[PDB]
Amino acid sequence: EIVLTQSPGTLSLSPGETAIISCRTSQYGSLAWYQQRPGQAPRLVIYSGSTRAAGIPDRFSGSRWGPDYNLTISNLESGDFGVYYCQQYEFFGQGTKVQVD
Amino acid sequence: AENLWVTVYYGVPVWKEAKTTLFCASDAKAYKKEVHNVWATHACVPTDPSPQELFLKNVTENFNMWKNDMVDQMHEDIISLWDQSLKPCVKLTPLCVTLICSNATVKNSTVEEMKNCSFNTTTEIRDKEKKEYALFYRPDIVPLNNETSNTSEYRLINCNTSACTQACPKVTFEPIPIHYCAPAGYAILKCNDETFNGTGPCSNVSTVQCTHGIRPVVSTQLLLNGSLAEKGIVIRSENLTNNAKIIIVHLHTPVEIVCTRPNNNTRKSVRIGPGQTFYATGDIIGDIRQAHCNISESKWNETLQKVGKELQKHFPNKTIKYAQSAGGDMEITTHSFNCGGEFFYCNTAKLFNGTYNPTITLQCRIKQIINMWQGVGRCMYAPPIAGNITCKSNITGLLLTRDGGTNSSGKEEIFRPAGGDMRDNWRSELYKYKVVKIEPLGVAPTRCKRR
Amino acid sequence: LINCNTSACTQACPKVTFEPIPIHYCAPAGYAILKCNDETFNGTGPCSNVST
Amino acid sequence: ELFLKNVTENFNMWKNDMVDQMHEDIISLWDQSLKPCVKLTPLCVTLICSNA
Amino acid sequence: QVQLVQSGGQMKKPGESMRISCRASGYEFIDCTLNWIRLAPGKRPEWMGWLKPRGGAVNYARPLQGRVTMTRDVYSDTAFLELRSLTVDDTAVYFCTRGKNCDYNWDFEHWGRGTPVIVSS
Amino acid sequence: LGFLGAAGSTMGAASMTLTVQARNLLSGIVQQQSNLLRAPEAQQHLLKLTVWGIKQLQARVLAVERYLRDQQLLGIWGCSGKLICCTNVPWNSSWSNRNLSEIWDNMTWLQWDKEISNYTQIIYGLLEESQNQQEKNEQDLLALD
Amino acid sequence: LGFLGAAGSTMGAASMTLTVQARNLLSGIVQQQSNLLRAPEAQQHLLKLTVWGIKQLQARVLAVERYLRDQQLLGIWGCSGKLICCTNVPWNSSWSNRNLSEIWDNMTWLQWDKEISNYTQIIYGLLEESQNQQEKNEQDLLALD
Amino acid sequence: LGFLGAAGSTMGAASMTLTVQARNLLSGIVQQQSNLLRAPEAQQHLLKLTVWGIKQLQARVLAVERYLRDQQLLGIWGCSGKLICCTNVPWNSSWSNRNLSEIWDNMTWLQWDKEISNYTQIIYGLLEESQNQQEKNEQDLLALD
Ligand SMILES: *[C@@H]1O[C@H](CO)[C@@H](O[C@@H]2O[C@H](CO)[C@@H](O[C@@H]3O[C@H](CO[C@H]4O[C@H](CO[C@H]5O[C@H](CO)[C@@H](O)[C@H](O)[C@@H]5O)[C@@H](O)[C@H](O[C@H]5O[C@H](CO)[C@@H](O)[C@H](O)[C@@H]5O)[C@@H]4O)[C@@H](O)[C@H](O[C@H]4O[C@H](CO)[C@@H](O)[C@H](O)[C@@H]4O)[C@@H]3O)[C@H](O)[C@H]2NC(C)=O)[C@H](O)[C@H]1NC(C)=O
Ligand SMILES: *[C@@H]1O[C@H](CO)[C@@H](O[C@@H]2O[C@H](CO)[C@@H](O[C@@H]3O[C@H](CO[C@H]4O[C@H](CO[C@H]5O[C@H](CO)[C@@H](O)[C@H](O)[C@@H]5O)[C@@H](O)[C@H](O[C@H]5O[C@H](CO)[C@@H](O)[C@H](O)[C@@H]5O)[C@@H]4O)[C@@H](O)[C@H](O)[C@@H]3O)[C@H](O)[C@H]2NC(C)=O)[C@H](O)[C@H]1NC(C)=O
Ligand SMILES: *[C@@H]1O[C@H](CO)[C@@H](O[C@@H]2O[C@H](CO)[C@@H](O[C@@H]3O[C@H](CO)[C@@H](O)[C@H](O)[C@@H]3O)[C@H](O)[C@H]2NC(C)=O)[C@H](O)[C@H]1NC(C)=O
Ligand SMILES: *[C@@H]1O[C@H](CO)[C@@H](O[C@@H]2O[C@H](CO)[C@@H](O[C@@H]3O[C@H](CO)[C@@H](O)[C@H](O)[C@@H]3O)[C@H](O)[C@H]2NC(C)=O)[C@H](O)[C@H]1NC(C)=O
């Protein structure tokens, strides 16, 4: 019973590199992302599709063009890779994650 | 361009929105005898004897029911007036003592809710005490299955929150209308056009010097005595997918609803101080029956199908199903309802058992230690009324919540009834009437020369 | 005491005096006061000798 | 003060409002005098007297 | 600045009831919403409920209708969650959270410490 | 009713009905002695302290402030009373350059006043310069010899 | 004192003393900085909440409301400041046709405007259209070419 | 800032900057909608009874009283709006006789009007009778035939 999805599923890249994540496809909503799991409860990273959240590094910024909705993640670190989530209204994704090294 | 055209025209029409307080206006004929404070307080001002309006050509303006602020102004003002009404004439209560009750046996049969209860108070002389019949209504006692309530004896429900205040016996409570006239430098704009979704431009616009009367009767999940819609059925709700937000549905046609407190009753006075008079029911007479309400099945069923078919417009192929109350406290789940000073809580399960695609009856219970409004303080204690009480009203709208969870195409959609924020009682009618200021210093370059 | 089936009597402040110290009245701008100097006035009807 | 020539006016004492105005005001000021500095009285207990 | 406190995780057996509590301090409870979120590794997060302490509206998620219950207590300033007939499916971690402001409820600025729940047999 | 009866009409039509705003910006229907209402009956309880008392006084004095401030801003330019005035100052280079035809033929003030708001201070400064020039010239004219 | 020392005199005499009411129409002996009384000594208890404080503010604001409303009704006809004004409009057919001699010779104004009260609005309308004609003529003269 | 930017300067310099007081004498930075401040955020508790509510109402109404009274004293002499005015009566014999040179060459107003303060009522009476002569002559001109 799912309408929301995101791509790409699993990504492999070294620490410090840059990658691109996107959420799909057409369902309306106030889009958002939640940070990778550090081990405790996660934190926010962005509001309203393109508004970087308070108290967050400047490595995060998204873009929205109707159905097209993408996010770039720059300068990854071993302290920031993990299981992160895409929010549309109430549902969530499929299980996206990024592994370091 | 001769002189390059600098000049000024006095006045000019132009306006911008602005936060600002509003003003009272109520029919000042009958309530000169309510010297103690009440909603449409006698002072206020007498109403305009000649309300006026005009239709404005080609005016394009966008209303917005959720963004405006005057509703919050009222939510503060009416609460403050309530407190100022129960600030004087109120006898703080040295109640909540060791006490005992037992089964009523008015007739040989046992009554349903009352229990004939002894009560040791303070006599006029502070040294002495005496026993009298007194207050018992089952929702307002801390229970136990033993020969007493509570761990033992009993106490009134208030006495670990705050001191309940006695309501003034002489102050009536009846919801007559009130009007609002902004002061000079301000005016009111009215969206006459129909089929309005609560936002976006409204074309048929008229300017009205003073807002029409509104009865701010408090209630939950059943709008009552509200002005009927213009035509058919509408859904004035700020965005449907936002299930957190509440959904308001408004009816063009009315439906009769009647409720009755059938039992005869009489109050007996009790003294609790030098000049402080307590009140509670003294005795009960005649046939015993619970408080209830009556409603016609056919009209209710018709209204629910009309609401269902109209709200289905906002979805392509989905179907709907109603359900009983969500849960939690009696205040929100049951149908909060007021007439004459006595209060009714009514279970609403029977009214929402239907589905989409002759005289129903309701169970109800009385409550008298009311944790009204915020639930944080200012707890009041109404006095019971003599004789029988019957009251009727025109149901006008309902509050709906969209639940949530995971959904799929071809699945069923479920709504539930809920009350909650009392602001959503007054947002129903006062969606009209934006407040606005005019800035009478328009300018534009035009040719001229002084001399 | 006689008071305790009517209302709670209030103590009078010992520091507050009580005397019939006089008071004048006077009106704000836009208003004025008129006075009938004439005598033998029955409480109604025209008064001739009038001063402001 | 000034005397006004030829002024004709009908004084009427019982109709005028200002007497009621002050009848309300003095009572309100009385209350505002005995609202503060006042000790609410928990008197009226058992007492017993006799010839002085 | 604001913080949310929890009593920690409690492990239990399949097929039974359980309770868990949370509280908030500062930014007064009586005005603004709350919500519960489920975190199961190897499975997606699933929103549970949203409670208005002002008047007690509850909007229990349909997939767990009935066996999940919740309430509040204004004076103590707490939030009780209840559920009945737990299974291994509810192997997860639980949180009490709030939105930034009191007009949106889908972008949660403040999260509790987290509280695991495991049942195996 | 002021502009509330003729707000949206043509550019020229607005000038013909500027006058009835004098009643509509001082009295108010309900605050005080108006064109429909007078003092209230139960004024003994209005003069005594009340929740709505402060509201009434606030509304009255706010209306007074509203009228007086703009009336002074109009008066200092020597335009007092004259519902249509005129100044001895040209218009600045920027903002400028919009044709007069549509502005009076069909346009209405509702769509015109927005874009001049941020530049509105500049007109006050230029009018102030005009009044300065006018008063010095008046003083010199007084100097007969 | 104004007409409190000159009310009942002749019409010609009345016009000769129309000025001093300006002090008598705004000042007030007791409410504020009058011609006889300054601020009171025990103002610490004046500023703190008191019944007579509300009385003071009520009286002041009512006087201000009154003066502003009258001066506005006078100003809109172009008569601001001028204690004697003049309008470019005739008088209607009814109510008229009274001989002028008694009105100026020995008449006193206390009995004059009793019968003019019900028709008083009509004079305001006539003066209003007078001002409308005057301002459009001013605009036409302003239109040099 | 009004005179607060150019108070102690020369006599002639003061006349050139009289205009920015109109904003300064009515607005107030903090009482109301100023040139820097608007209505407060938590106005629900400003409207409800509070000490500083009485303070703000008192201050605002006192400012209105002040401006209206001085404008009216200036208005009655026919000098409304005109920042520089002129009256139809020469100066009395006593006090008189001080040379003009120092006063405009180097004096500033601070030390000037202290001696004129006790005689100011005389100037008011002289301007008053001047206005009386002017209005009767206006009536005579009005008497065409
Ligand atoms: C929604 O809209 C509908 C439609 O408008 C509206 O319907 C009306 O609702 C009311 C109830 O809210 C219906 O019932 C009325 O109830 C009256 C009973 O109250 C009496 O007692 C009050 C207190 O005094 C008692 O106690 C003192 C001291 O102990 C004692 O001396 C007295 O004798 C009395 O026992 C009293 O306030 C009240 O009304 C008086 O005072 C008010 C306020 O000053 C004044 O406005 C009234 O005119 C009256 O003077 C009353 O005395 C009931 O009496 C009343 O009228 C019936 O009885 C009187 C007297 O017997 C008859 O003359 C009359 O013809 C009636 O038979 C009235 O019935 C009311 O009936 C509904 N309207 C209709 C048309 O049915 C709803 O309220 C709105 N709101 C909701 C939530 O639905
Ligand atoms: C209330 O409920 C709403 C759902 O009922 C909910 O959902 C949506 O929220 C967004 C807010 O971000 C609203 O805003 C936008 O609405 C447009 C309307 O479509 C028309 O206009 C677009 C113009 O959009 C351009 O600019 C945006 C950035 O602003 C770009 O992303 C976009 O790509 C464009 O560059 C126009 O393109 C549309 O054209 C169609 O064809 C083009 C070309 O193929 C497609 O690119 C496009 O996607 C579309 O297929 C069309 O003419 C919407 O299209 C935008 O995507 C964006 O959604 C929505 O209006 C709103 N939904 C509705 C139905 O109103 C709200 O969030 C909710 N609000 C609150 C406060 O709770
Ligand atoms: C004092 O205030 C309390 C708070 O409103 C009054 O109600 C009591 O509230 C508590 C809150 O937890 C109730 O607790 C019970 O907990 C058990 C735990 O198993 C649960 O099964 C019950 O359903 C309930 O939640 C308590 O029952 C409730 N009532 C009483 C009598 O304590 C309380 O009535 C006030 N008065 C007194 C004398 O406590
Ligand atoms: C309680 O309040 C009452 C009321 O003012 C106080 O005075 C009592 O008033 C009643 C009114 O009827 C008096 O009744 C007596 O009735 C008989 C009937 O035969 C008549 O002959 C008497 O002349 C008188 O009218 C009563 O005497 C009077 N006093 C008392 C002590 O009851 C009363 O004092 C207050 N205090 C108490 C403790 O009652």
Automatic annotation (TrEMBL), chain B:
Record keywords, A-Z: Apoptosis, Clathrin-mediated endocytosis of virus by host, Cleavage on pair of basic residues, Coiled coil, Disulfide bond, Fusion of virus membrane with host endosomal membrane, Fusion of virus membrane with host membrane, Glycoprotein, Host cell membrane, Host endosome, Host membrane, Host-virus interaction, Lipoprotein, Membrane, Palmitate, Signal, Transmembrane, Transmembrane helix, Viral attachment to host cell, Viral envelope protein, Viral immunoevasion, Viral penetration into host cytoplasm, Virion, Virus endocytosis by host, Virus entry into host cell
Gene Ontology cellular-component annotations: host cell endosome membrane; host cell plasma membrane; membrane; viral envelope; virion membrane
Keyword Disulfide bond: yes
Region feature CD4-binding loop, mapped onto this chain: 325-335
Disulphide bridges, residue numbers: C24-C44, C89-C168, C96-C159, C101-C117, C181-C210, C191-C202, C259-C293, C339-C391, C346-C364
Subcellular location: Host cell membrane; Host endosome membrane; Virion membrane
Record note on modification: Specific enzymatic cleavages in vivo yield mature proteins. Envelope glycoproteins are synthesized as a inactive precursor that is heavily N-glycosylated and processed likely by host cell furin in the Golgi to yield the mature SU and TM proteins. The cleavage site between SU and TM requires the minimal sequence [KR]-X-[KR]-R. About 2 of the 9 disulfide bonds of gp41 are reduced by P4HB/PDI, following binding to CD4 receptor.
GO BP annotation list: clathrin-dependent endocytosis of virus by host cell; fusion of virus membrane with host endosome membrane; fusion of virus membrane with host plasma membrane; positive regulation of plasma membrane raft polarization; positive regulation of receptor clustering; symbiont-mediated perturbation of host defense response; viral protein processing; virion attachment to host cell
Domain Human immunodeficiency virus 1 envelope glycoprotein Gp120, chain residue ranges per copy: 103-451
Membrane topology: Peripheral membrane protein; Single-pass type I membrane protein
Keyword Transcription regulation among record annotations: no
Any one GO molecular function term: structural molecule activity
Domain-related comment: The membrane proximal external region (MPER) present in gp41 is a tryptophan-rich region recognized by the antibodies 2F5, Z13, and 4E10. MPER seems to play a role in fusion.
The family this protein is said to belong to: Belongs to the HIV-1 env protein family.
Subunit architecture: The mature envelope protein (Env) consists of a homotrimer of non-covalently associated gp120-gp41 heterodimers. The resulting complex protrudes from the virus surface as a spike. There seems to be as few as 10 spikes on the average virion. Surface protein gp120 interacts with host CD4, CCR5 and CXCR4. Gp120 also interacts with the C-type lectins CD209/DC-SIGN and CLEC4M/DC-SIGNR (collectively referred to as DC-SIGN(R)). Gp120 and gp41 interact with GalCer.
Protein's name in the database: Envelope glycoprotein gp160
Species per Swiss-Prot/TrEMBL record: Human immunodeficiency virus type 1 (HIV-1)
UniProtKB/TrEMBL annotation, chain D:
Subcellular location: Host cell membrane; Host endosome membrane; Virion membrane
PTM comment text: Specific enzymatic cleavages in vivo yield mature proteins. Envelope glycoproteins are synthesized as a inactive precursor that is heavily N-glycosylated and processed likely by host cell furin in the Golgi to yield the mature SU and TM proteins. The cleavage site between SU and TM requires the minimal sequence [KR]-X-[KR]-R. About 2 of the 9 disulfide bonds of gp41 are reduced by P4HB/PDI, following binding to CD4 receptor. Highly glycosylated by host. The high number of glycan on the protein is reffered to as 'glycan shield' because it contributes to hide protein sequence from adaptive immune system.
Subunit-structure text: The mature envelope protein (Env) consists of a homotrimer of non-covalently associated gp120-gp41 heterodimers. The resulting complex protrudes from the virus surface as a spike. There seems to be as few as 10 spikes on the average virion. Surface protein gp120 interacts with host CD4, CCR5 and CXCR4. Gp120 also interacts with the C-type lectins CD209/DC-SIGN and CLEC4M/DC-SIGNR (collectively referred to as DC-SIGN(R)). Gp120 and gp41 interact with GalCer.
Domain notes: The membrane proximal external region (MPER) present in gp41 is a tryptophan-rich region recognized by the antibodies 2F5, Z13, and 4E10. MPER seems to play a role in fusion. Some of the most genetically diverse regions of the viral genome are present in Env. They are called variable regions 1 through 5 (V1 through V5). Coreceptor usage of gp120 is determined mainly by the primary structure of the third variable region (V3) in the outer domain of gp120. The sequence of V3 determines which coreceptor, CCR5 and/or CXCR4 (corresponding to R5/macrophage, X4/T cell and R5X4/T cell and macrophage tropism), is used to trigger the fusion potential of the Env complex, and hence which cells the virus can infect. Binding to CCR5 involves a region adjacent in addition to V3.
General remark: Inhibitors targeting HIV-1 viral envelope proteins are used as antiretroviral drugs. Attachment of virions to the cell surface via non-specific interactions and CD4 binding can be blocked by inhibitors that include cyanovirin-N, cyclotriazadisulfonamide analogs, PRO 2000, TNX 355 and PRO 542. In addition, BMS 806 can block CD4-induced conformational changes. Env interactions with the coreceptor molecules can be targeted by CCR5 antagonists including SCH-D, maraviroc (UK 427857) and aplaviroc (GW 873140), and the CXCR4 antagonist AMD 070.
Family statement drawn from the similarity comment of this UniProt entry: Belongs to the HIV-1 env protein family.
